[PDB]
Design a protein around this ligand. Structure first.
Ligand SMILES: Nc1ncnc2c1ncn2[C@@H]1O[C@H](COP(=O)(O)OP(=O)(O)OP(=O)(O)O)[C@@H](O)[C@H]1O
Ligand SMILES: Nc1ncnc2c1ncn2[C@@H]1O[C@H](COP(=O)(O)OP(=O)(O)OP(=O)(O)O)[C@@H](O)[C@H]1O
Ligand SMILES: [Mg+2]
Ligand SMILES: [Zn+2]
Lengths: 322, 976, 337
């Protein structure tokens, strides 16, 4: 069940840097899955790692047709060209290839679920991508408030009038449909709504077998991070543990190639102990893992949960071919 | 053993005599003579020559074999009988990047005035010229022998002698020659090229490249290219509170990467690293002083972080395990330095503050986790690309075909694959049986693939799982020291603040990284390359200090009078000496009262409170800060509420008298400036330049008058094939970058009254007052764009710049991030453009992305504005009309506004001219993904005609005029 | 959180200059404007700062009558806290704290828990533009109706719910839907400050908009008859509406005069922009159950904590912005009953 959350006003999600009296400038980051997970936990508690699992969260735009927007993959150049890693046996090294030069800049933006059903194959259309400005803007409120120095700057997320945030929740765990809850930093709220699972999901769910068998026959698999994941075993590391892919039935891995941005540093407030939660590092959303697996994948779903805190919404990954 | 290896490196360095271009016929014997008893063997000379030819100048070593009816020559002896040589002309030098051609003036003046251009073997009228040439060559050889003999006598160890020669042989020889012949003679002589048939790099750069190649291939070691990156940088730099944290972060990052560089250099050799060019680097000089090789000369200031965060080196590894050992050694050296700093902090500022408290035992078990958190903060990425040994055996055509087939087997995209195929064809277009391809022919391709690998392999991170607790208050991401419990953390940090109030504050609870960075300045006098250099930490504390560096209307800066207040630097001018003495006495009496009151509380060390006469915060010169006693105490860094002095009110007389004296000073010294300028600059498409795309065709880099005499096929090839850089050319490029980033930016920054923080290679980061920010920005841009200043190389490329003018009260992290955003926007919009932004204390934001020459005319109109020659209202009307204006009546409307708002007709005409000229260069951000328009604007061309051809010129011109008025408003606010 | 919500309304009696903007295009201090749309807006952070202060000063004078019974804060804190409540009284009178009941409603002071209410941004609903006939007009945009359509569904929702879905109108850049008092007689056209607009015939869109206003702001309309307003709505296109808000606001030049010479001082000249009077703003107020800290018996649930806020603020007159001393900021508020 999707959870549409249309913001009445702008939203600010606190970055880890403190802001009480000294660091008056308070920037914003993209909504971490923990914040939305806590908001949904409050919502279900009012209606009646949590016992229920949140698959993840994606942006959406409602202009006649209702479509969910997924973070732009790191596998797409700014010229809408895919990047594929091919290995050079002569030099013994593997490089990422865009067929137009060894250097490229990832395309910042989004990718609709129609894009997802076509991007997993290995091609991307033009209409499948949306720029960042079409969804949200960085609205910075200034001079909000012996108070001569209390004037502090705040940057918020100014979503477009037809754009909001949708949270993906597994079937069941039903609760209140229409209502309002607070999300973010400085006290703001959204007008959330409960909507049946979109036809895009079933479009990608039904066509999962084709991509799955293509991956199985070609011996190549790509894993796309829809939401950030904490893949460390003891600490926090970006290296993909080979046992992690052993759950889906990978007998052996030949080579693993991963491209991603700077890690996201975050923490939380432990309401039970009234102390901040341990700091964590997660691989940024939109990163893709290129693996050369031996064997086959027996996963019945086109997605899997990787890492810890997967119930919140972390580690939403899609299996794709390259 | 290792001594033999060092001696072999010395031999490889001097296989070409420094005066080789004077007479190519007997260069090898001259090199063997200058090497003295250290002269090479036979087979060792052969392998050294093979390494030299396989090294760079392959666009010359595969070109010097020109057999066009003779062997082409270009020397100074000009006795090369034409029966077999048919020389071209006098030697020249060409810039490795811009191909700018410079002749040799002073070297020809000392040469005999020959009556003919060419001379044969045994013609008449030759004996006198030959005798004169022999005399001058003997003098040069004697000077070189004296210099090298002194170097050999001073140093006994082969490694010490090798490094000393590599570092100072050129300088010492140049000094000796300028003592003997003339300064310009030595300057020209020391810049002679190695291969005269294509003088695109200096002889010594070729010698360094030859030494690096020979060391890479020696003893069966397979040469490998290694690139190292220590990341992240910008996020670590930004986490600062005062200017000292930012300086400490920059210097610490530079020190770590230079520790890795020094490990590599002491393992293999100083020349094995191509970027940065270590010669002449102040950090390299400090390292040499540490190794007891050469005493630090104090000529170059060490307070500047003059080492980039990446280095590229050419080393030879026996196997993969050797490379892994090298990587582990680099990582362990960096981690050892970090752990040494952490232990120093933990045992000098934490134990020394909790010497007896039970809290020390509570956090004693947390030393390991915080040490490991600090160690695992940065990411050290080492990427190595093994240099393929292309099979060059067989015929020349067969060898070139094999090399090209190997190139084609990589599957590279057609663009750079075609580029390298064209390069190989142009190399193989020469007519010579002995011509053969070399392994380093595709050195550019190896460098590009290595850069891609490093950019990919540096995205991998592995970081620990820190426990719970309240995070650090400065960085915000790491658990604070002793932050397990709020009460324990507050107690510990209050004790530390009481112990160290000059650095910390009443509400700071730092983590390992932030605390180490904060206490970094007080430790570095006891770290490896230091304690013998002197005054590494700069005498600038707060960001407001650099704002005060702006000079007032009486030829005197607020910073200078502040330094006079502490008594550091007396003021020479006596017209204001009495008022300055009155203000100094008032502030001294007030701080004496404050420190006497504080000593009663017995909460701070007496030594710290004794020095408050000298280290009091300069923000007290702001009349706003003196509104009462609590704010005055907070300005100095003391919390009145914590000390309980929030109720003291017997000092109001002193504060009022100080405020009156401050107003009296303001009467003619002007109010103290509250705005400073952050300027960070970057190299424009340096990767493309090193990839060969931005380089020009081989015709420019060759000798000018040899294109015609050569065979037609390779003539047209060099006409329409772009040159690709190579070890010696790369070394020359890095040498020009070092020359700029070391000898030029610090000088113009000091002349510009700014404070340079980091000048590593292409990048530059300075903090300057709003007075000289734009002037120094334009000066630095023109310096970088220059190709040959005097007799020293210069990068000859472009910079995008981001300049931010922000209030001193603004937090440092947000200002730095905004300046980085400005730089990124400048790069996004047709680079070689400066992005100027203004962030007022209220929070209003201005914007302008203009060409570097647009500043001067904008400065002129702003100067007209401040001088009351033109009313400021003309700006408001022009902004109002900028929305509804078109190119046809641009000039007429501007002329009407000028003649309306000016004083006379000439001022109005000048305003019209400067507005018309300046507003052409302004970058625009259209709705569509249009970079061609910005590219046209970036140079100055038929863009005006192209604008007529352009389909949305009205939006372009409207954005241009609006941006020009915005930037001129920024300038007017800055001056006023 | 925020179980229910209430709708507030604002009406600028005098021009309002609240906050500033990071744009700073021409005017030195523009008004707070939305980023994506560019409409004028009153941020919920600054709107709360005047809602809470006005609520606070009522406590010091005890005019917060709850359920038709006057509120006495001095005894209430002692009744519900005791022990240190006497010290709590001293701290509040020391200006280091705030009265008890306000902190349940508007959150604690600088020196726990959170406020039971949240103040949303005040989005514009009607903008005044000079006209030829019908001297001034209340102009809207179709998406402004769309914004009001969704927000009003949180409180009212059922007759208004059905009529809310009827708000769907497409308008070209020159057509308009206007009241009878604005249409030029004979020539079916409307002129709104140099712009000529053609009236589009309709009989529901203007009536529907004034229908929800009466049901959410009473029969009276901020001291004016409701029927006198229905004839002066002029719905225009989004581009026209967006352009009006950028350029139809009052830009006021200001300067300081020195008595020593009688002229103006050098550099003491700047221009500030004011929101026009007769600007019907509206802000959604989100209210939740307050934190249980032994609260008085009159503020237990959310329904009781919203009635006090609505009653104490209906027909109020508070000042917004930083020009109080020059008669700028006074706005009449009408809480949605
Ligand atoms: N000592 C230093 N002081 C200040 N700035 C530095 C220093 N060393 C490097 N920099 C600059 O800081 C920036 C950080 O570069 P970095 O290696 O982190 O990659 P990047 O291009 O910023 O992006 P990415 O993080 O995606 O790799 C660069 O612009 C670099 O030139
Ligand atoms: N001579 C050199 N040799 C090797 N590396 C160099 C040299 N000069 C600069 N570099 C490094 O090469 C890298 C270039 O990457 P960077 O992201 O800065 O792009 P660029 O080519 O400088 O231009 P742009 O920023 O406009 O894309 C930087 O890390 C810089 O320090
Ligand atoms: Mg660069
Ligand atoms: Zn920290």
């Amino acid at each position: 069940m999707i959870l549409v959350m249309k913001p009445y006003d702008s939203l600010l999600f606190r970055e880890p840097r403190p802001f009480d009296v000294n660091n008056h400038v308070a920037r914003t980051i993209l909504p971490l899955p923990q914040t939305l997970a806590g908001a949904v936990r409050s919502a279900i508690y009012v209606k009646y790692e949590p016992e229920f699992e949140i698959l993840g969260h994606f942006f959406y735009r409602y202009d006649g047709k209702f479509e969910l927007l997924v973070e732009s993959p790191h596998d797409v150049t700014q010229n809408l060209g895919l990047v594929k890693p091919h290995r050079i046996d002569k030099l013994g090294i593997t490089i990422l290839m865009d067929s137009e030069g060894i250097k490229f800049r990832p395309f910042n933006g989004f990718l609709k679920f129609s894009g997802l059903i076509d991007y997993l194959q290995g091609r991307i259309a033009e209409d499948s991508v949306v720029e960042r400005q079409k969804i949200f803007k960085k609205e910075r409120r200034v001079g909000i408030a012996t108070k001569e120095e209390h004037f502090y700057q705040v940057e918020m997320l100014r979503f477009s009038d037809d754009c909001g945030i949708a949270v993906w929740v597994e079937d069941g765990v039903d609760f209140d449909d229409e209502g309002i809850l607070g999300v973010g930093g400085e006290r703001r709220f959204v007008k959330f709504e409960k909507r049946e699972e979109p036809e895009c999901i079933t479009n990608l769910r039904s066509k999962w077998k084709k991509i799955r068998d293509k991956i199985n026959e070609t011996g190549r698999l790509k894993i796309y991070l829809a939401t950030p994941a904490i893949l460390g075993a003891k600490g926090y590391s970006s290296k993909l543990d080979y046992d992690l892919l052993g759950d889906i039935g990978i007998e052996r891995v030949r080579s693993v190639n991963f491209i991603g941005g700077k890690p996201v540093i975050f923490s939380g407030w432990d309401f039970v102990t009234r102390k901040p939660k341990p700091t964590r590092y997660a691989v940024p959303a939109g990163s893709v893992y290129f693996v050369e697996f031996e064997g086959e994948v027996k996963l019945d779903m086109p997605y899997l949960k990787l890492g810890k805190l997967t119930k919140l919404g972390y580690g939403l990954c899609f299996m794709g071919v390259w | 053993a290792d001594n033999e290896f060092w001696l072999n490196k010395i031999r490889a360095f001097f296989h070409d005599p420094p005066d080789k271009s004077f007479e190519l016929k007997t260069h090898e014997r001259r090199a063997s003579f200058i090497l003295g008893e250290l002269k090479p063997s036979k087979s060792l000379k052969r392998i050294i020559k093979n390494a030299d030819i396989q090294a760079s100048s392959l666009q010359r070593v595969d070109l010097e074999k020109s057999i066009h009816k003779k062997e082409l020559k270009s020397t100074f002896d000009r006795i090369h009988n034409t029966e077999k040589y048919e020389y071209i002309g006098q030697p020249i030098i060409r810039h490795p990047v811009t191909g700018e051609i410079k002749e040799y003036g002073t070297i020809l003046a000392n040469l005999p005035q020959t009556q003919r251009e060419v001379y044969d073997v045994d013609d008449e009228g030759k004996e006198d010229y030959e005798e004169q040439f022999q005399e001058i060559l003997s003098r040069i050889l004697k000077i070189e022998k004296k210099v090298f003999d002194d170097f050999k006598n001073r140093y006994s160890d082969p490694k010490d002698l090798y490094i000393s020669l590599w570092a100072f042989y050129a300088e010492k020889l140049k000094e000796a020659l300028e003592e003997e012949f003339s300064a310009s003679f030595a300057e020209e002589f020391v810049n002679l090229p190695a291969y005269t048939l294509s003088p695109d790099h200096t002889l010594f750069d070729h010698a360094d490249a030859t030494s690096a190649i020979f060391g890479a291939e020696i003893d069966g070691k397979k040469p490998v290219l290694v690139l190292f990156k220590i990341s992240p940088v910008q996020k670590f730099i930004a986490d600062a509170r005062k200017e000292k944290d930012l300086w400490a972060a920059s210097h610490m990052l530079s020190t770590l990467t230079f520790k890795a560089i020094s490990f590599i250099a002491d393992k293999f050799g100083p020349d094995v690293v191509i970027y940065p060019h270590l010669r002449g680097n102040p950090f390299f000089h400090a390292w040499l002083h540490s190794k007891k090789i050469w005493e630090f000369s104090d000529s170059h200031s060490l307070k500047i972080a003059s080492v980039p965060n990446k280095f590229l080196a050419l080393v030879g590894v026996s196997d993969e395990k050797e490379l892994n050992n090298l990587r582990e050694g680099i990582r362990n050296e960096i981690e050892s330095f970090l752990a040494d700093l952490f232990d120093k902090l933990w045992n000098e500022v934490i134990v020394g503050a909790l010497e007896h408290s039970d809290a020390l035992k509570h956090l004693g078990d947390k030393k390991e986790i915080h040490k490991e958190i600090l160690l695992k903060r940065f990411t050290l990425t080492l990427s190595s690309l093994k240099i393929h040994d292309v099979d060059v055996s067989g015929s020349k055509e067969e060898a070139y075909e094999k090399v090209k087939d190997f190139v084609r087997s990589l599957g590279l995209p057609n663009a750079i694959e075609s580029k390298y195929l064209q390069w190989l064809d142009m190399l193989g277009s020469v007519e010579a049986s002995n011509n053969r391809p070399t392994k380093y022919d595709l050195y550019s391709l190896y460098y590009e693939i290595l850069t891609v690998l490093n950019a990919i392999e540096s995205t991998h991170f592995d970081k620990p799982a820190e426990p719970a607790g309240y995070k650090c208050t400065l960085c915000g991401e790491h658990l604070a020291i002793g932050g397990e419990s709020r009460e324990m953390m507050e107690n510990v940090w209050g004790k530390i603040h009481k112990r160290w109030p000059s650095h910390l504050r009443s509400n700071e609870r730092l983590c390992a990284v932030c605390a180490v960075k904060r206490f970094y300045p007080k430790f570095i006098e006891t770290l490896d390359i230091f304690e013998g250099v002197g005054k590494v930490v700069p005498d600038i504390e707060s960001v407001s200090e650099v704002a005060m560096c702006r000079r007032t209307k009486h030829g005197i800066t607020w910073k200078e009078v502040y330094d006079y207040l502490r008594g550091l630097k007396n003021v020479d001018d006596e017209k204001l000496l009495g008022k300055l003495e009155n203000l100094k006495h008032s502030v001294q009496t007030l701080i004496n009262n404050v420190k006497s009151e504080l000593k009663s509380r017995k909460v701070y060390p007496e030594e710290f409170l004794e020095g408050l006469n000298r280290n009091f915060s300069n923000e007290i010169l702001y009349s706003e800060r003196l509104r009462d006693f609590n704010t005055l105490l907070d300005t100095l860094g003391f919390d009145a509420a914590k000390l309980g002095l929030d109720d003291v009110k017997n000092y109001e007389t002193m504060i009022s008298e100080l405020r009156e004296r401050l107003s009296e000073v303001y009467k003619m010294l002007g109010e103290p400036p509250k705005y400073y300028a952050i300027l960070m600059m970057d190299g424009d498409e340096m990767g493309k330049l090193l990839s060969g795309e931005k380089l020009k065709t081989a015709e420019h880099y060759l000798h000018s008058a040899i294109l015609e005499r050569v065979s037609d096929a390779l003539r047209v090839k060099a006409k329409t094939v772009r040159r690709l850089i190579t070890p010696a050319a790369h070394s020359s490029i890095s040498r020009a970058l070092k020359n700029f980033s070391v000898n030029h930016v610090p000088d113009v920054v000091r002349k510009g009254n700014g404070t340079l923080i980091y000048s590593g290679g292409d990048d530059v980061l300075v903090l300057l007052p709003v007075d000289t920010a734009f002037d120094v920005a334009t000066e630095l841009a023109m310096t970088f764009s220059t190709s040959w200043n005097g007799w020293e190389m210069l990068p000859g490329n472009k910079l995008s710049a981001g300049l931010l003018i922000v209030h001193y009260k603004h937090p440092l992290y947000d200002a730095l991030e905004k300046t980085r955003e400005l730089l990124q926007k400048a790069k996004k919009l047709g680079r070689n453009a400066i992005a100027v932004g203004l962030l007022k204390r209220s929070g209003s934001y201005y914007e302008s992305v203009v060409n570097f020459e647009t500043l001067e005319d904008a400065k002129a109109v702003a100067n007209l504005l401040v001088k009351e020659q033109v009313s400021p209202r003309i700006i408001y009307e022009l902004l109002n009309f900028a929305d509804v204006i078109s190119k046809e009546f641009l000039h007429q409307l501007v002329k009407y506004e000028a003649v309306r708002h000016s004083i006379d007709k000439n001022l109005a005409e000048e305003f019209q001219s400067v507005f018309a000229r300046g507003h052409q260069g302004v970058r625009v951000e259209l709705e569509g993904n249009d970079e061609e328009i910005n590219k046209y604007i970036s140079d100055g061309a038929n863009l005006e005609t192209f604008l007529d051809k352009y389909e949305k010129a009205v939006d372009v011109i409207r954005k241009q005029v609006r941006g020009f008025l915005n930037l001129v408003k920024i300038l007017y606010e800055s001056i006023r | 959180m925020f179980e229910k919500a209430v709708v507030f309304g604002l009406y600028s009696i005098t021009p309002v200059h609240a906050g500033s903007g990071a744009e700073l295009s021409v005017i030195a201090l523009p008004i707070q404007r939305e980023r994506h749309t560019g409409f004028p807006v009153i941020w919920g952070q600054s709107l709360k700062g005047v809602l809470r202060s006005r609520f606070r000063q009522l406590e010091l004078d005890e005019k917060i009558e709850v359920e038709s019974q006057k509120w006495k804060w001095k005894e209430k804190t002692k009744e519900v806290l005791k022990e240190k409540a006497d010290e709590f009284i001293k701290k509040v009178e020391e200006r280091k704290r705030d009265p008890l009941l306000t902190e349940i409603v508007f959150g604690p002071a600088t020196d726990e828990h959170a406020g039971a209410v949240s103040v949303g941004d005040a989005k514009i609903l009607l903008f005044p533009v000079r006209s030829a006939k019908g001297v001034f007009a209340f102009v809207t945009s179709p998406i402004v109706i769309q914004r009001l359509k969704e927000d009003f569904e949180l409180v009212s929702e059922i007759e208004l719910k059905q009529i809310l879905s009827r708000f769907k109108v497409e308008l070209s850049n020159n057509e308009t839907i206007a009241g009878n008092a604005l249409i030029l007689n004979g020539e079916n056209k409307v002129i709104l400050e140099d712009i000529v607009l053609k009236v589009k015939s309709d009989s529901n869109v203007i009536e529907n908009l004034v229908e929800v206003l009466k049901t959410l702001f009473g029969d009276n309309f901020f001291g004016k008859p409701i029927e006198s307003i229905k004839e002066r709505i002029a719905i225009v296109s989004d581009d026209v509406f967006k352009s009006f808000t950028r350029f139809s606001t009052e830009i006021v030049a200001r300067v300081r005069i020195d008595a020593e010479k009688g002229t103006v001082a050098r550099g003491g000249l700047w221009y500030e922009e004011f929101l026009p009077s007769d600007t019907l703003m509206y802000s959604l107020i989100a209210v939740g159950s307050p934190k249980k800290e032994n609260l008085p018996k009159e503020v237990d649930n959310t329904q009781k904590i919203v009635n006090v806020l609505k009653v104490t603020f209906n027909n109020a007159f508070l000042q917004i912005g930083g020009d109080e001393t020059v008669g700028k900021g006074f706005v009449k508020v009408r809480a949605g009953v």
